[PDB]
Design a protein around this ligand. Structure first.
Ligand code: NAD
Ligand code: NAD
Ligand code: NAD
Ligand code: NAD
Ligand code: NAD
Ligand code: NAD
Ligand code: TTN
Ligand code: TTN
Ligand code: TTN
Ligand code: MG
Ligand code: MG
Ligand code: MG
Lengths: 553, 553, 553
């Protein structure tokens, strides 16, 4: 580092607090600016964990923990590192959604880069304003589809901020190499538009060509400063834009859309674990999605990709997938429009056309039900019992977020199906003890199990473009870590507590994969990928800031 | 110092070059950015002296020495400290004059603060731009009367730059507590106006109320940022303005005029010493100046002041002084105009009116002749032979600078009067050996003998305004240091080799005087003035940049 | 740019002098710190050229131009650009060697990075100390074979500084992306060892493994901070080490040796041109080198590379080349040893063994004579007259530097062979007018025609390793720019005045080549190489530093 004195205390990337040794203190000119006591990170964490236990509401705790990050980065990740399983719900879903829902009211210090449509033509001057000079990963949003909460405009910057947090907390990507970005083109949320605390532009969402230049000007400005192979992960964009931007840049830049492909990998991994227990014939497999958007279409494809790879032709596989959106079942010739991506899963209409999802479930008789509408409890007990009746061991995936927008709860799933089902939820749900003593621990089908390890590998391997197979592999690497004993208690995914090692494990297998497919451009090719990855992960342990002083002979 | 790395080297105020000890190098991040050798200031000064010897021209030497000032401040002053008497003619008169004459051609790096009439109304933003926060001394010019060279416009910034050099070199005034300023309101110098290299406004001198308001705004802006008692020394302004500004601000700010008052002190000191060898009766004294501007009136003033303190009434004192300017003898009722300041020295015309200065010397028959017209060799051999005939020991002062503007040379003074005369010149002149073997070492009547010492006192004493009697006392304190032996060799002033110690001794005498007259506001009053002063002179030895590291009990 | 105020003027990479516009002065906090005048780069260079035309000696000039670089970088390259042909001899051979010869005496401000054997184990800390964080090209030396001046220790940093100047002055490589490095491991020059001004370690050259460790620690340190394909150009190392390191790193890093491969490329281009005038049958070709080190071996091998490319087998190619070193002709069975590299040109002794070069010339009767011993005038008139007698059109190359160590002069060559020869020198020589009115313009066989454009292409194409074919192509690309009429005046090389375009042209021909050979890794591959290259060349014109201020809708 190049600065000394107070500036080392103000910069959270360098600030250690009373953890600065007396040498550093005296040496860097901090002596007298800190109390005579010299703490350890151990104690600093203690003070936090003790102060946090006294808090009552999650948003109060979210404001607290996120405030460390703007104070002392290393202690902040040490805090997360100490108990990820418990800080997850606060720093990530569901509390992150409640946070964005009132970002402008709890705003203290700003985080991330902000790019509004009012800066069109100068997106590069802004980019150049970012303090970090070696960014490797960018997570971008326009806040049109923030979780299942809809259009939150600029109030949505809490999403990329919380995702990049997991980048470091789970895969150990360097914090100073990540960059959260929020593109402000207006908002259609009228409540926000009449809110004095709104942080974005007081205008409705611009949907013209002006919008497309902007993302273009952005993509180009970013790569022009940080490199052509900078990882750019699109997050929570509208359905229309997510797909068109993914198809627009996936081959131009190193980009991927978490909501489309990240979600695919995790659901496929969970579905894969489920087959481990059901061992049902690939032929008698039938899946019905609640929703036909980004996630549904992404999961659908990756699933067909696993089927193809397992025999079933692309066609015979797609015929195993049905989708039910806000207008009903996707069937050929329906009044409601079907897009390019849906075509493949739109079939000739069944005998009777379902009016309700419970109808679809009874007409189709699916073996798997995956909710991805973000519309609420659409998996009524009638739907669940329906499934429980149709399937000895039905697979129910309630993946919408946050919790309030989930299709159903761990509670209802297990209870209504009498502990026969295979439950998975996008948001956290506690274990479920049944009258008859049995206890089920539900897994969390969240992309957070994929995107950190998959971003690690892509960065470390200097990959140029992310192919969809990479996510097929990352799904296998994930489900390859589920133990028969973890499987034993209802978990379709490895314990969240072990997410850091799982991530790392995924990143390794994925790099191995990239190199093996001539997709990794880092030279030379490490002989031992495992060692290559672990040797490169960022640690939260304070680093010495003392000058290199040595004697001359 | 609060910086580290390359910046310490870029800043000449902190730069040591190869003198940065190895520890400083490693601790301040300079290791690798400097050659493996660790020199001593002593070696550094050798390199310089070794190099300067190879140089043929003074301007080439000036460009070189002034260049250390913009590279290594400590080394630069060390260099001057090494041999002030030989470096003076270069860094100062006469070489400075020649440097100013083409400042625009030899420009490398800018020095000082520049304020042009075009910045009117914003002078304070400019002042706030100065990097140094605790200025205590300012030397300012508008370049209208640069030495005897006339209006040189912004090319005259070399003057304030050199006066402040001799502030530190002679009196040990901190270099970062000094600020040379240039007020560019245009120039009347046709040549510079048609010169592509000129550094100021291409416009005739602004002599409207716009100018007076600029000076005012400057005086205010400066004191507003640094203090009401900040020392402002006016240098080389036009006759009219010099007086106008001095009367206007001498009681408002802590300011003085060097050309008027600094000159007066030195011509008095010299005149005092001369009287020691002559011991002529006060009644018989009769002085005649060649010139009647700033210096002549400033000296005529202090002379009269002495005479009054030694009997004579101010009225009869004045009557012993005569003046002869570009239009001839100042006499009551002459056609050319006399002003407020010259009226006391404009007398009823003599029996015959002198056409030339030689005529004056013969009609008037003065004991002392003080040249200060800045017009060249006006003290013709005849003027000289005339004086030696009129007086046994004539007193001849050729004070105009630079050397080419001087009224005569030592060589002419001594040889033409047969070593009888008592000479002093404004510019440097070497010893003169007469054919009869006698060797006379002329003294230099230059205000550099006065301003550095007076400035240090006024600063250290937190004095608010500088009265004329303070320059009277600085004259006594200067003459009181001339030894009989030095007097014996024709020196009317202490060797210039001892200018540093002469200056500090004058500093102490003036401080003693200030506190004695209730004009010093520094509390508490230092019991021992002498030590108080020497205790606070800036030294040229490299200081340590290492931090204050020490173990804890 | 992230800094305002004085720091912008101190940093030469940003400083514009009086070239800062009034808007920038006011906006960046420089108003008042610069004279009221606003100059253009055009007048700034005018002042320089005018000031320089007054200087008498080249070292005094070299000191003046190199100081501009430490004051205002863009103006420095502007003056260079203005007349490269005239400033070449000063900023480069022969004045650069003269400067090096007494680097410690003319030392003003440090340039480049220094790494001594005493920093072994902390080389990374030294590199981390370098202000620029995006270096792409490095020119490193140990001052062991500085030109034909031998061991100059650290006084040799002048060389890597000057080479990196031609990088920018000729191929428009960004100055801030270049890093000159000097490795001080001691020196054997006793004259330096007892020199009080010497800037390195007062110890004899360390030649143990500790030396190999250091070079290795540097190689890693460098790539660690700036990337695995950072260009590292070894310059003027000892014969043994030059080859040792080339063989050792050429495949691990992106490195090359200027003295070895550079010279090869430039001599082959000159030879090639000469073959255009001679048309001699490949069969009848016979080459004899004066010297058998870095340069000779490097040229020898590239010559062979070309003959084999045109029929001749490697074996019969080598048979055409003879070398005469300080011990005499390299023949099989001689007492003076022969290394691995010379083995190929160490033939069975001729009839009569030559004791002098003149003998070798008359024994062997070569068609081409290439002096590269740096031992002085060894191409005696007798040696020349002999060549003119043996060959109607003899090819004489006096490639040693500086001019004093050159084998012979242009005048000697042309005059003694009566304008029949084909001359090329490694140092500048004026045209030669023969008594019969004929005027010859000798070419300059200096690698300066090669290393810039080649470095540009390698940098631009992100090449990982530099093959020897690259230099073959660079030779063709260079000789392909010589014009009939240019040849017509005896030029075996394009005029030096066009050195910039030539470089760029060679740069493009090489990247086209790199790409065509799958040796460039910059993604994606530009369709039009020409535009791609001119697109990215650093320009000497001042860039605006004004922030991007724009109105919001
Ligand atoms: N768990 C994870 O890893 C993860 C990842 C990404 C998105 N999600 C969640 O998935 C939900 C939807 O996101 P998306 O990207 O698929 O959105 P989208 O807007 O692209 O698609 C939503 C789909 O659900 C349909 N729908 C809406 N209301 C419906 C209703 N009442 N009945 C039936 N269908 C209805 C819509 O027609 C649409 O096809 C969000 O709540 C989001 O939080 C979860
Ligand atoms: N001050 C600076 O600008 C600076 C300082 C140190 C290193 N660097 C860069 O780092 C590279 C040196 O290679 P290396 O050993 O660091 O990695 P590497 O070459 O093994 O890995 C390849 C890429 O992965 C990135 N990377 C490695 N670990 C990362 C992590 N934990 N989180 C996010 N990104 C990570 C690297 O930046 C690199 O571009 C050089 O290309 C250099 O430009 C820059
Ligand atoms: N970083 C800073 O801003 C800084 C640092 C050290 C001291 N100071 C100032 O210095 C004063 C401390 O008292 P002191 O004992 O040094 O002085 P002092 O009280 O004995 O002297 C009186 C005045 O003369 C000035 N002075 C002393 N030596 C000087 C010199 N060699 N050249 C030019 N001016 C000189 C002082 O600034 C002071 O204003 C305080 O007023 C303080 O504000 C400021
Ligand atoms: N040695 C020192 O310490 C010192 C200090 C200040 C000024 N000076 C020198 O004194 C000279 C004048 O400065 P000033 O401030 O008195 O200037 P000024 O402009 O105030 O006055 C100059 C006077 O000289 C007169 N004059 C000009 N030419 C004359 C001539 N040819 N014959 C007779 N009289 C003539 C003018 O009429 C005018 O009255 C300058 O050359 C200056 O360098 C020396
Ligand atoms: N502040 C910074 O750290 C910063 C700022 C701007 C650009 N960059 C870097 O520059 C690259 C952007 O692409 P580009 O259009 O500059 O080049 P490019 O991608 O077309 O060229 C490929 C390589 O050539 C280098 N290069 C280009 N011109 C050069 C020149 N004139 N002299 C020396 N090297 C030159 C680049 O550094 C790059 O690594 C990115 O890799 C980015 O990391 C870094
Ligand atoms: N013009 C260019 O572009 C260019 C480039 C690189 C080197 N050079 C010059 O080439 C010269 C040598 O460089 P190098 O790297 O080849 O050196 P080197 O030390 O590797 O080889 C020098 C050779 O000259 C021989 N030699 C020495 N004295 C001799 C003598 N008196 N008679 C016959 N042979 C003698 C040595 O035996 C040795 O074989 C230097 O003067 C250098 O300036 C020129
Ligand atoms: O961000 C997320 O956690 C997920 O992609 C979602 O939208 O639910
Ligand atoms: O500047 C001086 O040294 C003096 O006041 C003069 O004007 O000659
Ligand atoms: O560096 C040079 O100028 C050249 O390679 C030489 O050694 O003569
Ligand atoms: Mg999301
Ligand atoms: Mg003056
Ligand atoms: Mg060389």
């Amino acid at each position: 580092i190049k600065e000394k004195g107070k500036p080392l205390m103000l910069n959270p990337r360098t600030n250690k607090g009373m953890a600065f040794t007396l040498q550093e203190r005296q040496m860097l000119g901090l002596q007298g600016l800190l109390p005579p006591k010299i703490e350890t990170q151990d104690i600093q964490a203690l003070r936090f964990h003790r102060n946090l236990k006294k808090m009552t509401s999650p948003l109060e705790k979210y404001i607290y923990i996120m405030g460390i990050q703007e104070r002392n980065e290393k202690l902040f990740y040490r805090i997360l590192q100490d108990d990820i399983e418990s800080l997850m719900p606060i720093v990530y879903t569901p509390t992150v959604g409640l946070a964005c829902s009132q970002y402008g009211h709890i705003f203290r210090r700003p985080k991330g880069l902000f790019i509004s449509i009012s800066d069109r033509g100068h997106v590069r001057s802004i980019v150049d304003n970012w303090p970090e000079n070696h960014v490797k990963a960018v997570v971008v949003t326009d806040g049109e589809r923030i979780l299942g909460l809809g259009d939150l405009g600029v109030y949505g910057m809490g999403i990329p901020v919380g995702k990049l947090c997991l980048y470091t907390a789970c895969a150990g990507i360097r914090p100073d190499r990540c960059l959260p970005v929020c593109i402000d083109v207006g908002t259609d949320n009228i409540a926000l538009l009449k809110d004095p605390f709104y942080m974005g532009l007081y205008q409705k969402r611009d949907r013209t060509q002006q919008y497309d230049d902007l993302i273009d000007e952005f993509m180009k400005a970013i790569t022009d400063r940080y490199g052509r192979n900078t990882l750019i992960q699109f997050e929570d964009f509208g359905n229309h834009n997510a797909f068109r931007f993914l198809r627009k840049y996936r081959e131009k830049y190193c980009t991927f859309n978490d909501d489309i492909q990240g979600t695919a990998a995790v659901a496929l991994a969970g579905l894969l674990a489920a087959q481990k227990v059901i061992s049902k014939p690939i032929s008698e497999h039938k899946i019905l999605f609640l929703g036909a958007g980004e996630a549904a279409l992404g999961i659908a494809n990756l699933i067909v990709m696993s089927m193809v790879e397992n025999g079933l032709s692309e066609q015979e596989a797609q015929k195993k997938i049905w989708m039910f959106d806000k207008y009903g079942l996707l069937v050929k010739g329906r009044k409601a429009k079907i897009d390019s991506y849906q075509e493949p899963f739109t079939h000739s209409a069944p005998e009777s056309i379902p009016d309700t999802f419970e109808d679809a479930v009874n007409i189709l008789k699916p073996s798997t039900i995956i909710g991805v509408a973000g519309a609420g409890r659409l998996f009524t007990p009638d739907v669940i019992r329906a499934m429980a009746s149709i399937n000895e061991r039905p697979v129910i995936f309630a993946l919408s977020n946050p919790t309030a927008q989930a299709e159903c709860t761990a509670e209802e799933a297990y209870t209504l199906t009498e502990g026969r089902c295979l439950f998975a939820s996008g948001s956290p749900f506690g274990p479920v003890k049944l009258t008859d003593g049995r206890v089920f621990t539900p897994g969390q089908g969240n992309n957070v199990y994929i995107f950190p390890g998959v971003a690690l590998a892509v960065i470390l391997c200097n990959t140029r473009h992310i192919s969809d197979s990479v996510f097929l592999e990352a799904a296998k690497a994930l489900t390859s870590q589920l133990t028969d004993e973890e499987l034993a208690q209802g978990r379709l995914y490895p314990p969240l507590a072990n997410i850091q090692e799982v991530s790392i494990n995924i990143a390794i297998k994925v790099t191995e994969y990239l190199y093996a497919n001539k997709m990794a451009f880092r030279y030379p090719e490490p002989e031992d990928k495992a060692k290559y990855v672990k040797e490169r992960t960022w640690r939260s342990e304070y680093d010495s800031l003392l000058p290199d002083v040595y004697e001359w002979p």
